[PDB]
Design a protein around this nucleic acid. Structure first.
Lengths: 490, 229
DNA sequence: GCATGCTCTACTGCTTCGATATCG
DNA sequence: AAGCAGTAGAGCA
DNA sequence: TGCTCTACTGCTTCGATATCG
DNA sequence: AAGCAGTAGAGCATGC
C-alpha cells in the first residue's frame, strides 16, 4: 500500500558469553550490538521517522513480557524513534554499563528457544496500523541452542515456519566469534557478517513515492488517454520551525485577523477590494476577477505535432523534468497505445510536443515529451524506467542576451597539456555522494541538542575538493601551464 | 538608463483599406502598437515615447514647406506615457483620408528628437516605422539624410504589412499574404526599402523587415532596450 | 391508494503530506 | 528579512 | 577651486507564509 | 493526491 510503514524488532542474545569479552580485550559483542542498534535508531529518527522500532533482549535473569514467560525481558515497545527511548538505550556501555545491565535485569539463565519468537509475534500482532515489511534482526553468535533436546529443535523449526507463512521474515547478523566467515552451519533454512550499513550509511534520506498529478493526454481533438506525472528530483529542504512558549514548552496556536476601519470593528472578507495603483490613479477589481484573468484551458496535455530528438537543444532549461506514465485507471487500453507510440517514436527518433496545464486554473505552458527506454541485466541495474520525459521549454522572456563583443584567440599548444591535466584528473564521476553540508551539520546539531552528548559532530565536507591529493597528484606541470605564454607579464 | 523611443505610423487611406475578408492594415497596426505601448506603460520602466502620424487630413506640423510636409502631425513630445498616450491611440477612429508620402516622418521625428535631447541624457534612439507603402516617393535629397542616419547611429525598425510576396487570420504560423496582396507600387516599395536597409546597416536590415502577422506572433518589437543582466 | 419501515451502494467531505506560488 | 558591490552627494586642501 | 567616505540602493537569495491537490 | 469512513437516497416489503 501507500501508507504501510516499515517495522523492525531488534532481538539481542544475552545468555552466556557475549556479556563477557569472549576472553579478549578489544570489544565485547554486546557493546557491538548496542552501538549498532543506537546507530540504526539515530539513522531512522530523521531518515524514516514514521516507522516502528522495538528492542528485546533475551536470556536475561529477570523477566517482563505480556505473555509471562520465564527469562524473556522486553525493553521498549513498537512506536516511533523517540529521543527519550534512545537516552534510555545508551546506558549499557562498557563495564559500568555491563554492571548496570546486571543490576537492572541480570544476565545468565537457562535460555529457552522459540517462545522468544512467540513474544515477537504477539508484539507484531497488537499494532493498530498497517505494516509493509516485518523484519526480525537477530544479533547473536552461536550455533546450537538446542544442543541436548531434539524436540526443542523440531519446535524451533515449526515456530519459525509459523512466522514464515504470515509474512514475518528474519535475518541474523551472525556475530563472528574469532572475526571471520567460519560457521557455514545449518541455519540457512531459518534465514531467508557485515555491519557497516547498520553502522553509518544512512545519515540523510527520506522515504516517499507520490504521483504529483493525474492528467489526460489528448491528441488535439477528441482522442483521450490517461497519464500520470511522477517526480524524480524534488530538491529537499530541512523541516521548518514550530513556535513555542518557553515557560512550559507548548505551542501557542497563532491566530491573525484584519480589523480597525480607523474606528474599531472587524471586516469579514466581503468588504475588501483588490487594488493596484499605477502612478496617480488606481485600478480596482474584485477577487473573482483578479483570479479569473488567468484562465486558458482545461487541465491536461494537448498534443501539437512531432519533432525529432535532435533539433531541441537540451541545454534550454528552467525547471526540472518530470516523468509520465500510462495508467489504466482513468481510461482503459492506454499502455497499448503508449507502448506502440513509444516504439515507433524510438525507431523513428521522434518526440512529441505538447501544451500543458497542470491544475484547474493555470495559464498554458509548452512542454516537449522526449522518449526513453529502459535497461536491465542479470544484476538488475536500473538507471532508466521505460517512459517519457517532459523537458520544459522557455517562451520568450526567459532568455537574456549577453553583450558578446570580445573575440581574441591564441596558439593551439595549451590544449595538449590541458588534456594531460584533465587525464590526470580523469575518473568515473559518481553514482551518489556529494551530500549537503548545511543540512547535514543541522542534522547533527539537532542530534547533539536532543541528546546533550558532547559537541557538534563536525560533518566531513565531501563537497570540498582534495587540494592536497590534487596538487602533488598533478605535480610540476602547473608552473609550465601557468608560464608557457600567459604569465600576467606585469 | 533612459530610453527615448519614437513611433512613426502611416495612417493613410489605403492603410484603412477595404476588407476582402481579413482586417484593415490600420487595425493591424493599431493592435501591434497597443501591445507595445501597453507593455511599456504597464512595466513601470523609465522611458519616454514620442509619436508621429502621417496620412491625416490636416498638417499641424512644426515644418510644412509647400507641397511636401503634408498630413504630418506631432502628437506628443518625449513623455513618460500615461493613459493619455494610450487614449490618443485608442480614441482615434478617424484615419483622415489624404495621403502624401512616407519618408517625411523620419526626418520630422529626427528634428524633434534633436529638439528633445535638451539636457536629458539618453543612451538609445530607436524609431519604429509602420507603413503600408502605397503612395509615391520623394527623392529630392537622399545621401544627406542617409548620412545623418549613419552619423547619428540611431536605429530604424521597419514593420511592413502582411504582403511578403488557408484562412490567414492574423498570425497562426500560417501564411503571410493570403494569395495576392502585392502590386507594382508595393514591388518598388519593397525593393527600395530593402536597398536602403541593406546599404545602411547590412543584412540585419533584411532581418529588420517584420510582417504584421509575425510581429504579433513573436517578441520582435523589443530590441536594444534592456541592459546587461 | 397513501403512509411508513428497513438496507445497501455510491457520493462526499475530512485528514495528512508534499509540492508550488508569494511576500518579506 | 539579510548582504554586495554600483552610482552620485559631502570633508580636508 | 580637487579625490575618498557615505547615503542610498537595486537586486538577490533564503526564510516564513499561504494555497492546492 | 490517497485512504477511509459516514450519511443521504432509492427501492422492496408492510400496514390502514
Amino acid at each position: 500500500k501507500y501508507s504501510g510503514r516499515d517495522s523492525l524488532i531488534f532481538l539481542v542474545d544475552a545468555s552466556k558469553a557475549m556479556f563477557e569479552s569472549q576472553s579478549e580485550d578489544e570489544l565485547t559483542p554486546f557493546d557491538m550490538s548496542i552501538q549498532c542498534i543506537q546507530s540504526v535508531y539515530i539513522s531512522k529518527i530523521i531518515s524514516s521517522d514514521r516507522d516502528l522500532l522495538a528492542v528485546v533482549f533475551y536470556g536475561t535473569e529477570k523477566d517482563k513480557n505480556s505473555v509471562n514467560f520465564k527469562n524473556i525481558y522486553v525493553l521498549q515497545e513498537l512506536d516511533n524513534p523517540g529521543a527519550k527511548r534512545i537516552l534510555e538505550l545508551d546506558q549499557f556501555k562498557g563495564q559500568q554499563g555491563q554492571k548496570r545491565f546486571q543490576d537492572m535485569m541480570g544476565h545468565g539463565s537457562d535460555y529457552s528457544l522459540s517462545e522468544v519468537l512467540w513474544v515477537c509475534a504477539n508484539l507484531f500482532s497488537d499494532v493498530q496500523f498497517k505494516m509493509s515489511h516485518k523484519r526480525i534482526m537477530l544479533f547473536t553468535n552461536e550455533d546450537n541452542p538446542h544442543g541436548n533436546d531434539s524436540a526443542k529443535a523440531s519446535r524451533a523449526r515449526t515456530k519459525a515456519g509459523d512466522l514464515r507463512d504470515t509474512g514475518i521474515f528474519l535475518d541474523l547478523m551472525h556475530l563472528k566469534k574469532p572475526g571471520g566467515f567460519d560457521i557455514s552451519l545449518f541455519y540457512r533454512d531459518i534465514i531467508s557478517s557485515k555491519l557497516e550499513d547498520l553502522l553509518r550509511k544512512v545519515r540523510a534520506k527520506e522515504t516517499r513515492k507520490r504521483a504529483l498529478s493525474r492528467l489526460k493526454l489528448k491528441l488535439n481533438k477528441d482522442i483521450v488517454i490517461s497519464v500520470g506525472i511522477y517526480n524524480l528530483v524534488q530538491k529537499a529542504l530541512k523541516p521548518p520551525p514550530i513556535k513555542l512558549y518557553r515557560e512550559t514548552n507548548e505551542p501557542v496556536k497563532t491566530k491573525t485577523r484584519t480589523f480597525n476601519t480607523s474606528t474599531g470593528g472587524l471586516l469579514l472578507p466581503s468588504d475588501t477590494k483588490r487594488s493596484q495603483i499605477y502612478g496617480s490613479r488606481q485600478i480596482i477589481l474584485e477577487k473573482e476577477e483578479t483570479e479569473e484573468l488567468k484562465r486558458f484551458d482545461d487541465p491536461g496535455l494537448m498534443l501539437m505535432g512531432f519533432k525529432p530528438l535532435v533539433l531541441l537543444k537540451k541545454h534550454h532549461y528552467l525547471r526540472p523534468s518530470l516523468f509520465v506514465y500510462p495508467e489504466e485507471s482513468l481510461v482503459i487500453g492506454s499502455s497499448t497505445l503508449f507502448s506502440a507510440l513509444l516504439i515507433k517514436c524510438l525507431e523513428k527518433e521522434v518526440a512529441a510536443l505538447c501544451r500543458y496545464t497542470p491544475r484547474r486554473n493555470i495559464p498554458p505552458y509548452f512542454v516537449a515529451l522526449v522518449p526513453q527506454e529502459e535497461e536491465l541485466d542479470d544484476q538488475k541495474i536500473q538507471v532508466t524506467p521505460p517512459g517519457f520525459q517532459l523537458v520544459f521549454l522557455p517562451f520568450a522572456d526567459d532568455k537574456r542576451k549577453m553583450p558578446f563583443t570580445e573575440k581574441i584567440m591564441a596558439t593551439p599548444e595549451q590544449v595538449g597539456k590541458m588534456k594531460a591535466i584533465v587525464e590526470k584528473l580523469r575518473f568515473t564521476y559518481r553514482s551518489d555522494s556529494f551530500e549537503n553540508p548545511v543540512l547535514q551539520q543541522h542534522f547533527r546539531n539537532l542530534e547533539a541538542l536532543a541528546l546533550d552528548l558532547m559537541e557538534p559532530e563536525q560533518a566531513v565536507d565531501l563537497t570540498l575538493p582534495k587540494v592536497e591529493a590534487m596538487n602533488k597528484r598533478l605535480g610540476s606541470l602547473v608552473d609550465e601551464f601557468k608560464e608557457l605564454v600567459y604569465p600576467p607579464d606585469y | 538608463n533612459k530610453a527615448a523611443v519614437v513611433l512613426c505610423m502611416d495612417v493613410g487611406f489605403t492603410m484603412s483599406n477595404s476588407i476582402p475578408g481579413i482586417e484593415s492594415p490600420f487595425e493591424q497596426a493599431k493592435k501591434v502598437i497597443t501591445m507595445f505601448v501597453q507593455r511599456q506603460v504597464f512595466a513601470e520602466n523609465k522611458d519616454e515615447i514620442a509619436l508621429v502620424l502621417f496620412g491625416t487630413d490636416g498638417t499641424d506640423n512644426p515644418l510644412s514647406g509647400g507641397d511636401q510636409y503634408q498630413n504630418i502631425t506631432v502628437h506628443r513630445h518625449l513623455m513618460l506615457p500615461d493613459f493619455d498616450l494610450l487614449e490618443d491611440i485608442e480614441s482615434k477612429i478617424q484615419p483622415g483620408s489624404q495621403q502624401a508620402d512616407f519618408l517625411d516622418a523620419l526626418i520630422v521625428s529626427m528634428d524633434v528628437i534633436q529638439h528633445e535631447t535638451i539636457g536629458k541624457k539618453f543612451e538609445k534612439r530607436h524609431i519604429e516605422i509602420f507603413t503600408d507603402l502605397s503612395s509615391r516617393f520623394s527623392k529630392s535629397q537622399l545621401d544627406i539624410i542617409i548620412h545623418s542616419l549613419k552619423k547619428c547611429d540611431i536605429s530604424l525598425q521597419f514593420f511592413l504589412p502582411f504582403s511578403l510576396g488557408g484562412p490567414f487570420r492574423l498570425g497562426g504560423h500560417g501564411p503571410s499574404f493570403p494569395l495576392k496582396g502585392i502590386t507594382e507600387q508595393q514591388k518598388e516599395g519593397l525593393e527600395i526599402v530593402k536597398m536602403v536597409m541593406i546599404s545602411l546597416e547590412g543584412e540585419d536590415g533584411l532581418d529588420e523587415i517584420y510582417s504584421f502577422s509575425e510581429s504579433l506572433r513573436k517578441l520582435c518589437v523589443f530590441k536594444k532596450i534592456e541592459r546587461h543582466s
